[PDB]
Design a protein around this ligand. Structure first.
Ligand code: HEM
Ligand code: HEM
Ligand code: HEM
Ligand code: HEM
Lengths: 146, 146, 146, 146
């Protein structure tokens, strides 16, 4: 990832204020609603049969928080997303066999939640910069396939 | 495209409240900022060298109006998108050689721009519903390649 | 999916010399080797942990003959792709939750397999028409998500 | 790009047998036939309106060789794809505005062309490795957008 210094400062000025509970629940719930094939990764979590069921689901909510913590770390290490994510790459690729496309799609969902939460401060350039971050994190997650 | 009763009703309702003059222009502007290669189709519109020149460009705006009204037509014809866009497919495909992937990408941008503006009313099932709509429109635009 | 009368004759002609006991299994196996996440759909098939294991697996080859028969059904009914895949789309989407991207991949794998077996008569236009046919197939298999 | 010592050994021996004057022209040509939107980048090239026009265009073959040669540079330096391609990445991204997806599609075409000229030597593992390699090159060409 390269961010312009104007992009960079903005991107992290905004992350400072992110509610991980709201953003994490919204992001992961919306993945499973918008892209329902993804549910077959979380059969364990229980009831995922409707949007209310997915969104209220406490394990869905709790796992989104953890997902966001990882992105929080990606953020604090944009120079080496590939090392930051090396072990998560091994988990999702070697063991979970998550399709790399789903990494992209969660990324894109995360972006549209942030437009939803960053409000007026979510300008075209701030949007461009977060799309780069979640694309780099996606590529880094899929690294054990490459 | 298949939508359920809930979905369609909230779809059109949210769509009722969209500004005709502003949204297409913000989505078309955002596409060219986030995905800067798409600028190659619009160089005759003027200066696209910075985010500010893309977003403020009057042709980008004015053209975005036509883009938004095309989607509007699509919403009115979800039954027959392929027939609805047959003429715009010839234009984009045979004459302008727009990559199918760019159609997809504008739809995703239009989805974030809705999420940005309608915050809480852009529920997960309404996002799912707009995702299905824009991808349908993208497919029908790409019909000439197929 | 549009082919010219030139296109379909070339395509059907070539299709006639496709070894139906092996091309299917070759494409399924190459899918499984080339994009190893797809293996999560077939864990009841026995040993898949080496290229050799995969390519030898009798249930890969058994299955591929069935895959190949469904592409022949597709090739016969290009004006009725959606309808022709209605039942498989129910299976693959509502029962098996296969990601749509994987339908596209298998298609592309089937393309390189044909090229691998034919040469002489696998002209640039036949390759283009087969890509179209397989993209039509994948889009029909994903119908239930649309 | 990681390759296994067997993949690397096999991949290099195959590339040893590639006609550097022809395979790259066949790739670029088939790209232009199969995914005909890519024709719009080649503004110098004259007539691209039929498959013969694309495949025998002198500039298609001459440019094809340059492309092939750059792929050799990558296959030689698999630990150093970002560096090997930095200058091409500027060109393609900043100056020419080539969509990443198209870098990927050119890769996939090349893979099939190889499949087309090699037969059983083109094992499932060798296909897998080339797909890795070509995706690596696509990602290093798109570096300036990231
Ligand atoms: C793209 C960004 C993503 C990030 C940053 C991320 C992050 C994480 C983290 C931090 C864990 C917890 C691992 C542990 O310590 O044990 C995890 C687990 C998991 N992730 Fe992801 N993930 C991502 C995408 C995906 C996607 C797209 C899927 C599936 C569609 C997925 C499926 C899973 C599953 C199934 C688990 C195991 C959860 C469990 O413990 O039950 N992840 N992920
Ligand atoms: C996916 C939804 C899209 C819709 C609904 C749409 C709709 C339209 C409409 C209505 C026109 C004008 C018809 C006329 O006035 O003669 C048009 C023109 C055009 N569109 Fe699109 N379009 C879409 C996507 C794209 C994309 C992704 C690109 C390029 C990145 C693109 C590039 C163009 C260009 C270059 C023109 C001609 C503009 C001019 O010179 O006046 N469109 N589109
Ligand atoms: C793209 C073209 C595809 C075609 C034409 C196709 C065709 C078929 C057919 C005809 C069946 C029914 C078999 C039977 O009743 O015995 C089937 C089953 C199945 N397909 Fe597909 N398929 C395709 C893609 C995929 C992909 C991409 C996946 C996963 C990566 C997949 C996974 C399965 C599975 C898991 C079954 C059930 C397997 C079993 O229990 O034997 N298919 N497919
Ligand atoms: C993905 C692998 C690719 C490689 C290895 C590659 C390599 C190169 C090379 C070596 C050059 C010439 C550098 C020079 O002579 O100054 C070049 C120029 C170019 N490439 Fe690519 N390229 C790739 C993909 C693409 C794609 C997908 C497109 C468009 C669809 C594209 C469009 C061009 C254009 C328009 C030029 C300039 C042509 C000219 O000089 O007239 N390339 N590429």
């Amino acid at each position: 990832v390269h961010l312009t210094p104007e992009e960079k400062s903005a991107v992290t000025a905004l992350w400072g204020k992110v509610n991980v509970d709201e953003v994490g629940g919204e992001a992961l719930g919306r993945l499973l609603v918008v892209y329902p094939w993804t549910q077959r990764f979380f059969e364990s979590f229980g009831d995922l049969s409707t949007p209310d069921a997915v969104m209220g689901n406490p394990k869905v909510k709790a796992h989104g928080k953890k997902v966001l913590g990882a992105f929080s770390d990606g953020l604090a290490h944009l120079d080496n997303l590939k090392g930051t994510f090396a072990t998560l790459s091994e988990l999702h690729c070697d063991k979970l066999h998550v399709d790399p496309e789903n990494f992209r799609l969660l990324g894109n969902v995360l972006v549209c939640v942030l437009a939803h939460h960053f409000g007026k401060e979510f300008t075209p350039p701030v949007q461009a910069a977060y799309q780069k971050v979640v694309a780099g994190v996606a590529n880094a997650l899929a690294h054990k396939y490459h």
